Ligand binder design. Sequence first.
Ligand SMILES: Nc1ncnc2c1ncn2[C@@H]1O[C@H](CSCC[C@H](N)C(=O)O)[C@@H](O)[C@H]1O
Ligand SMILES: Nc1ncnc2c1ncn2[C@@H]1O[C@H](CSCC[C@H](N)C(=O)O)[C@@H](O)[C@H]1O
Ligand code: SF4
Ligand code: SF4
Ligand code: SF4
Ligand code: SF4
Lengths: 320, 317
Amino acid sequence: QGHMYNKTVSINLDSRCNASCDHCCFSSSPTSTTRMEKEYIRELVTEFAKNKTIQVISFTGGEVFLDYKFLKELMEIIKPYEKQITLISNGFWGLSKKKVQEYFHDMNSLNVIALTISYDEYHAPFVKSSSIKNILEHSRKYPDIDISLNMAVTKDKMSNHILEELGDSILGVKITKFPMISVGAAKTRIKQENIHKFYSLEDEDSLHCPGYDIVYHHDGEIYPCCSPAIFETKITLREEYNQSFERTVEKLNSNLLLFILRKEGFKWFLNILKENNKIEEFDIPYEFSSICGVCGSLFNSAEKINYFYPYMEKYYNENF
Amino acid sequence: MYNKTVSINLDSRCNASCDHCCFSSSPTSTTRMEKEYIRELVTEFAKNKTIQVISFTGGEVFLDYKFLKELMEIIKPYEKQITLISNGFWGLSKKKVQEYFHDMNSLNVIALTISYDEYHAPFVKSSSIKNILEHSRKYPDIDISLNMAVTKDKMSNHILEELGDSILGVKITKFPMISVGAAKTRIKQENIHKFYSLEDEDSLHCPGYDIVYHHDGEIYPCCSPAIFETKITLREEYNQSFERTVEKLNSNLLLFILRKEGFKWFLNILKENNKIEEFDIPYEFSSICGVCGSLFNSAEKINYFYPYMEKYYNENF
Ligand SMILES: Nc1ncnc2c1ncn2[C@@H]1O[C@H](CSCC[C@H](N)C(=O)O)[C@@H](O)[C@H]1O
Ligand SMILES: Nc1ncnc2c1ncn2[C@@H]1O[C@H](CSCC[C@H](N)C(=O)O)[C@@H](O)[C@H]1O
Ligand code: SF4
Ligand code: SF4
Ligand code: SF4
Ligand code: SF4
């Protein structure tokens, strides 16, 4: 009956990227300076590799293959401990058939179980279609590596032609088209009318958090999930510079707000706001692109989080 | 090993008559296990302590929804997880869609795969698929996938574009045809993508075993369309327990050699004996399973390997 959320961890290596996507939740670019120091990352990876509960370590950015020597070094620290690795990339490195062969050999040797390639109309000005095809076609030689294609779309950029132009390189590839979260470059460079809004406050029984997944982010913070929407809230997991993963897990499992959110869903909070006529005061959007859209507006201020304190206190007293 | 999941193929009858169908399913297909026998199998899998997931397939499982719901209700007190695969014909009615999603959510259905492509399109309307995909947003605990069977002449590019934003958040997988069932005779072999060949011994390994109690009354070691035309059965008698099925899978010599040595062990025997042409092994194929089908689709072909498997067992262990 122990702690949860300690089987996986993600590390965001850098905000620097070869691309400058108009939707990028991190506003990544070749001149982005936000990152944890390399030695600090080596210490985190070493701890995650030695950790008794972590099975999967995931890397993200930014573009993790941009400084491949560093990525390979981190994968090599993990190797003797035999933990599984997941990578996500824009596939710019697909331009070189030599880098494609070499990187797939490294990933297969370093227990990389999944590689996600992001490609769509927002990525297209920075990466050639043929680079994506080279990666997808070569991955057929590495069946143990699960390959996914993630396409970020809007009403004006649905990536219909992009997919058709990839031809048969996508056969056997898990494709997922998803809507934008209005965060980072998407807030200012994309018209809110082009972002799909599928969910509404009327879908109260369907409003449930997709799940917690710890992220040691490139801004030096630790977040409870991988959603772009979490950065705008006041829900963090870091209390000091030298923090162990055991402490990170302990803080997450003992967070009362995150416990009630998991057990009761967003309806518990929304129903308190409706009964107290504070939905408009809290600026809760009627419609949203994802469940995380409510999360942002419910907890984007210390006062909003503090509003729920007497109700959370009452809930703990009643059920504990 | 291989005892955490099980699949049951409820019927070969289907509302559709897809030109690629590995079972050649149609509304006039008569092949199926009896209903009472299926009730007994489901009851046994529900009571089994090791099985976590029970999957249903056909045919079209929603065609006789009353029987599907009855089977899901037998499992319910035992709290096993269920997976369903469907052509989504039932998507025509939004009211029907809400009802089935409510049942699915109450009956621990963790995954629903919808099959849609140019082969399915003459039998199911695009708007039916959209209704299912859009309503699934209300059930985040049900994992939704879209499986599209394609050829060089039917890549389902328009099909996907016509689904619009209903596919947002849906795992889409386009895959090539296995030359089995209706695809063998109704599709030109030049339109089936051939990614693999006998030369690349790498990637000539079985993806893995998954027990299926099929609509022909046999038991298969995997869910691949290719296996249903082989003579590899795990059934020895009418009333056979899942423990016996697992025991037979774990002690099957041909499947042990296939798992450890890969398809190269069998192909090298045929090449060495100049029987590749005699056995009709395709030089090029869409998937690894394409070799499996041609290696073992007759008792004569399977029996050929027996003295070699006997030699292998004597040499090893
Ligand atoms: N505002 C936003 N809303 C939704 N997804 C976004 C987003 N900003 C970025 N993403 C997606 O988040 C993923 C990780 S971004 C960092 C990894 C890498 N450079 C890449 O592009 O894969 C990508 O699939 C990207 O398209
Ligand atoms: N010859 C073949 N090659 C490859 N996939 C095939 C096939 N025959 C059938 N399939 C696929 O196998 C899956 C299960 S068929 C039975 C389930 C249901 N009627 C359906 O269509 O989903 C479907 O996705 C179908 O497209
Ligand atoms: S979405 Fe990925 S590739 Fe595009 S700018 Fe952001 S980090 Fe770079
Ligand atoms: S609902 Fe909130 S905590 Fe859950 S994934 Fe979305 S942003 Fe993160
Ligand atoms: S592929 Fe599925 S929907 Fe099409 S005929 Fe076969 S069983 Fe029926
Ligand atoms: S058809 Fe053969 S190779 Fe394919 S999954 Fe079944 S047993 Fe494995």
